[PDB]
Amino acid sequence: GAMAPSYRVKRMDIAKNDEECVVNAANPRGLPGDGVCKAVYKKWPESFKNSATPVGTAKTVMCGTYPVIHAVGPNFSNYTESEGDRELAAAYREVAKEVTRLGVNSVAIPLLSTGVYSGGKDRLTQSLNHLFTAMDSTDADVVIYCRDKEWEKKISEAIQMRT
């Protein structure tokens, strides 16, 4: 476990993370994809061997000894708001199980379903709150990765408001 488990946010490419494992914002088919998924494919391509897994699940594949947790959020283009919200919660719960099983002291994590799976809506708060519900019972240091300057400020504010 971490000595004083924390949340932090950084605005940079998650493929350059300083944590003991990474969460990929994967597609269900284990394809290279776009955005976070394509950065993860370039950095850890070996982790895409048999990485396909259903929506609402996470599947870990090692790249050497470095764990890549492939977490499949719902595409809100296809899911109803109700069923998508349930699957997005479930994906983060499966991430927390994997992080616990691996015994890591730190994890790098993107906001699932906030990019091309957002169905054209701002889901910062929805996705971050499901991240917190799952990860609050874990003792890993959690480092959230984002790319937008305004999102960095809002995630930082949300972390600080609980402390």
- What residues are designated binding site for ADP-D-ribose? 13, 27, 35, 115-117
User: Is 117 near Cl ion (CB under 5 A)?
Assistant: yes
Phi and psi torsions of 64, nearest 5°: 65, -120
Amino acid identity of residue 157, one-letter, is E
**C-beta closer to Cl ion: residue 5 or 35:** 35
**C-beta closer to Cl ion: residue 38 or 101:** 38
The distance of closest approach from Cβ of residue 59 to Cl ion in the complex, given in angstroms and rounded to an integer, is 17
Sole binder of Cl ion in the list 2, 6, 12, 157 (CB under 5 A) = 12
Separation between Cα atoms, residue 149 and residue 94, nearest integer Å? 29
User: What is the DSSP track for 7-54?
Assistant: EEEEES-GGG--SS-EEEE--TT----STHHHHHHHH-GGGGTT----
**Binding pattern to Cl ion, positions 135-154, x when CB under 5 A?**
-----------xxx--x---
**C-beta closer to Cl ion: residue 41 or 151:** 151
**Binding pattern to Cl ion, positions 20-59, x when CB under 5 A?**
----------------------------------------
Query: Could you tell me the two tokens for 31?
Result: 């394809």
The distance of closest approach from Cβ of residue 149 to Cl ion in the complex, given in angstroms and rounded to an integer, is 9
Query: Each residue of 44-78: b (16+ CB within 10 Å) or e?
Result: beebbeebebebbbbbbbebeeebbbbbbbbbbee
**C-beta closer to Cl ion: residue 18 or 65:** 18
**C-beta closer to Cl ion: residue 79 or 117:** 117
Q: How many residues interact with Cl ion (rule CB under 5 A)?
A: 8
C-alpha distances in Å from residue 99, one per residue of 1, 12, 75, 117:
11, 22, 23, 23
Alpha helices for 103-148 (secondary structure H): 124-135
State the residues that interact with Cl ion by CB under 5 A.
12-13, 115, 117, 146-148, 151
